[PDB]
Amino acid sequence: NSFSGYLKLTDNVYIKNADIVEEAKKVKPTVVVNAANVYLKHGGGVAGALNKATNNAMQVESDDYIATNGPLKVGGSCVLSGHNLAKHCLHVVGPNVNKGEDIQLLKSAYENFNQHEVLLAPLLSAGIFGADPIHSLRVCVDTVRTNVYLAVFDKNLYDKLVSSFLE
Numbered sequence: 001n002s003f004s005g006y007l008k009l010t011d012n013v014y015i016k017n018a019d020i021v022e023e024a025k026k027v028k029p030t031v032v033v034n035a036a037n038v039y040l041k042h043g044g045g046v047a048g049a050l051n052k053a054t055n056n057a058m059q060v061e062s063d064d065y066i067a068t069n070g071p072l073k074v075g076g077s078c079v080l081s082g083h084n085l086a087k088h089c090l091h092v093v094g095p096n097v098n099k100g101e102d103i104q105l106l107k108s109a110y111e112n113f114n115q116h117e118v119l120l121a122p123l124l125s126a127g128i129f130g131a132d133p134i135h136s137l138r139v140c141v142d143t144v145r146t147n148v149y150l151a152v153f154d155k156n157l158y159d160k161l162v163s164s165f166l167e
C-alpha cells in the first residue's frame with residue numbers, strides 16, 4: 001500500500017490525478033476497486049482497462065463467478081482475485097444514470113468499500129455512467145469510513161474536484 005503523491009481531503013479519503021491501472025501496478029494494493037456492471041462484462045472504460053492489464057484473466061474469472069452466482073445488483077459488489085494488480089479486486093456496481101438507474105444507489109455502492117481497510121478506487125458512476133462527479137466525491141466522503149485512495153485519470157476533473165471540496 002505504497003501510495004504516493006496523493007492529496008489528503010479528509011482523515012480517510014485521498015485523491016490523485018492518475019490512471020488507476022498504473023497506480024495498481026506501482027502500489028500493489030490489498031484491494032483495487034473495479035467500476036463494474038451487473039454481469040461483470042469488462043467491455044470498456046475503467047473495467048476494460050483493468051481487465052486488459054490482467055491479460056483477460058479477470059474476465060474469465062468474472063464469467064465463472066456469474067455462472068455460479070448469477071449477476072450482481074446495482075449498488076452491490078463481489079470480491080474476486082486481484083491478479084497482478086492487487087491481492088483482491090472489489091467489483092462494485094454504481095448506478096448508470098445514463099441508463100435510468102437511481103442515483104440514490106451510489107450510497108449503497110460506496111458502502112461496499114467499508115468491508116476493506118485500505119482500497120485503491122475510481123470515482124464511482126462518473127464518466128459514461130453519467131453521475132455528477134462532484135456529487136460522487138461528496139457521497140464517497142460522507143459514506144466511506146475506511147481508507148480510500150481515489151485515482152482520477154483527468155487533470156481537469158481532478159482540479160475541479162479538489163476546488164469543489166475545498167470551497
Ligand SMILES: CC(C)[C@H](Nc1ncnc2[nH]c(-c3cnn(C)c3)cc12)c1ccc2c(c1)S(=O)(=O)CCC2
Pocket residue numbers: 018019020021035044045046047049122123124125126127128129151152153154157
Ligand atoms: C471520470 C474519468 C476520468 C474516470 N476515468 C478513469 N479513472 C481512473 N483511472 C482510469 N484509467 C482509465 C484508462 C486506462 N486506460 N484506458 C484506455 C482507460 C480511465 C480511468 C472514470 C471514473 C469512473 C467511471 C468511468 C471513468 S467510466 O467512464 O469507465 C464508467 C465507469 C465509471
